[PDB]
Symmetry: none
Subunit: 137 residues, 3 copies
């Protein structure tokens, strides 16, 4: 907590999409225009969570399209990773957040370390929409 520093979430997502582009040659991955949101947290952990989300979308959902977004509000930030993959069935969302890599346990762990939550929804893109809701500073 004394370990938490300023984190430009939008910048983090931008760099995340860029590095993911180089790792996954199939992949159309981008940050959707978002206002600049700064929170206090653990930049490695938050980047890990995004990396891990993108990695599941591709390795396990077979996504060829991923969209990152950040929406600011008085409560904090809502980070979403949307993909056009096979998705995650409503019935399977729980094991998935308990499983380490389909396994998103790293995401739930980092969400919790930040006082926040990670949840799965369905994406307009066709696959999963993973949502990290982190309290603001």
């Amino acid at each position: 907590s004394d370990d938490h520093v300023p984190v430009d979430i939008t910048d983090l997502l931008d760099r995340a999409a860029h590095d993911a582009a180089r790792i996954y040659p199939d992949l159309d991955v981008s940050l959707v225009p978002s206002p600049t949101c700064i929170i206090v947290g653990l930049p490695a952990g938050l980047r890990l969570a995004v990396d891990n989300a993108i990695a599941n979308a591709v390795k396990h959902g077979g996504a060829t399209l991923v969209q990152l977004s950040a929406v600011s509000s008085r409560a904090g930030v809502e980070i979403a990773i949307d993909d056009n993959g096979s998705g995650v069935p409503e019935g399977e969302r729980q094991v998935v957040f308990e499983r380490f890599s389909l396994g998103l346990a790293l995401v739930a762990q980092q969400a919790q370390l930040h006082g926040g939550t990670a949840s799965l929804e369905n994406s307009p893109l066709g696959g999963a929409r993973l949502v990290l809701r982190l309290p603001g500073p």
Copy 2:
């Protein structure tokens, strides 16, 4: 585990900055690299890097060192390249079996992370120590 998210790329950047202060006249830097997060032991990873720089300078007589990290689905390949004397091809194993020219600390850390440490010939002229570490996804 006591393993936590580690931004390998930032670790290298700090290592090079700190090394440049200990070793006057050493030209040491992180080469342009994507941000790579793994789960690992930041004190042990930093120490492995520190040890590799120290061996390059103290025993290889290096005046130029470049750190790098290359990311893949498999994880990360960290390299410490130097312009020193190098390690002859027939001598690499003995060097890894020795503590500090001795790189056993490096091998120990690589093994703790489920990866490998090895020596190659550097484009700079001296040794290239490569740590290959599995990713978290």
Copy 3:
């Protein structure tokens, strides 16, 4: 082995943050310092820093303490400087033999093949220097 990689810098930071909570009317911080990883005993090294701070405050009446780490090829020099009343010159070796009482600090220095000594601090009180050899 008991001795494991220790980020000394991070250790000093945690020590300062916790001390700032424990002692009323204390300004205690880590001064900008490189990351120094040594191999050592984390519980014992933290105890040593904790003990140095406790001595400065409780016995020295310090209201300001600065922790710092300087690295070199030989290892790390950890310093705990204070604005308290200091340690009298005639006491500065013997204090490391007693449990005002710094035996815990000397014990950890020795376990690490290092040294602990006391000098005057630019802040007015004591400067406790702990020099630990590096792992390379």
